[PDB]
Amino acid sequence: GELAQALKELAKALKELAWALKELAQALK
Amino acid sequence: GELAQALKELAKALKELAWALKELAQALKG
Amino acid sequence: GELAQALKELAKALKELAWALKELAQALKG
Amino acid sequence: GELAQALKELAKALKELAWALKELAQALK
Amino acid sequence: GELAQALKELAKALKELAWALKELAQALKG
Amino acid sequence: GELAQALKELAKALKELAWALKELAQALKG
């Protein structure tokens, strides 16, 4: 219910955080 | 539940971490 | 309940980190 | 059982992470 | 359980984040 | 199980962030 929806919301953020990390990795070379 | 409520505040905080890192990334690229 | 308040707390921790990294980011772009 | 022990292990790390954050805050002033 | 196993790998990662931030803190203080 | 692999994944995310911040830290101390 309300928790399966909260869980994909965490899934989205987790992807978002990865993308930012690749951007910062890129920025450090 | 209140667990779900928790996961919701964590997803919100991850998102702001993600934004901050992109901000930091750009700060360094320029 | 066992776990909810531990994940809520990790959310505040990351939120603080995000603010921390915006300040760092600001310091570096000047 | 094994999960109540894992949970205080997360509790410890959470404290540890806070302490590092105050150190970095300190470092930025 | 496998949930507990998860919380264990998260506590381990928080600890290394904590170390990295202190490393970053010192990098800036000097 | 629902949640385990999401928290395991957040652990890898933070581990990567910690490595990211060690590199940043190294870049700044020279």
Numbering used by the authors:
A (entry chain C), D (entry chain C): 1 to 29
B (entry chain B), C (entry chain A), E (entry chain B), F (entry chain A): 1 to 30
Sentences from the paper on this structure:
CCs are quaternary structures comprising two or more α-helices supercoiled around each other with cyclic (Cn) or dihedral (Dn) symmetry. Here, we describe variants with all combinations of the aliphatic residues, Ile, Leu and Val, at a and d to give four classes of peptide: the ββ class, with a and d = Ile or Val; Lβ, a = Leu and d = Ile or Val; βL, a = Ile or Val and d = Leu; and LL, a = d = Leu. Peptides are named systematically appending the one-letter code for the amino acids at the a and d sites to “CC-Type2-“; e.g., CC-Hept becomes CC-Type2-LI. In summary, solution-phase data and X-ray crystal structures demonstrate conclusively that different classes of Type-2 coiled-coil (CC) peptides—i.e., based on abcdefg repeats with predominantly hydrophobic residues at a, d, e and g—adopt a range of distinct states.
By contrast, those of the βL class and peptide CC-Type2-LL showed weak or non-specific binding of DPH. And LL sequences form collapsed structures. Surprisingly, the X-ray crystal structure of CC-Type2-LL-L17E overlaid almost perfectly with that for the parent CC-Type2-LL; i.e., all six Glu-17 side chains are completely buried within the core of the assembly. However, the cognate structure for each sequence did not always have the lowest score, as apparent from the off-diagonal white and blue points. This occurs for all of the LL-based sequences and those βL sequences observed to form collapsed structures. For these, we propose that the collapsed states are adopted as they lead to more hydrophobic burial and contacts.
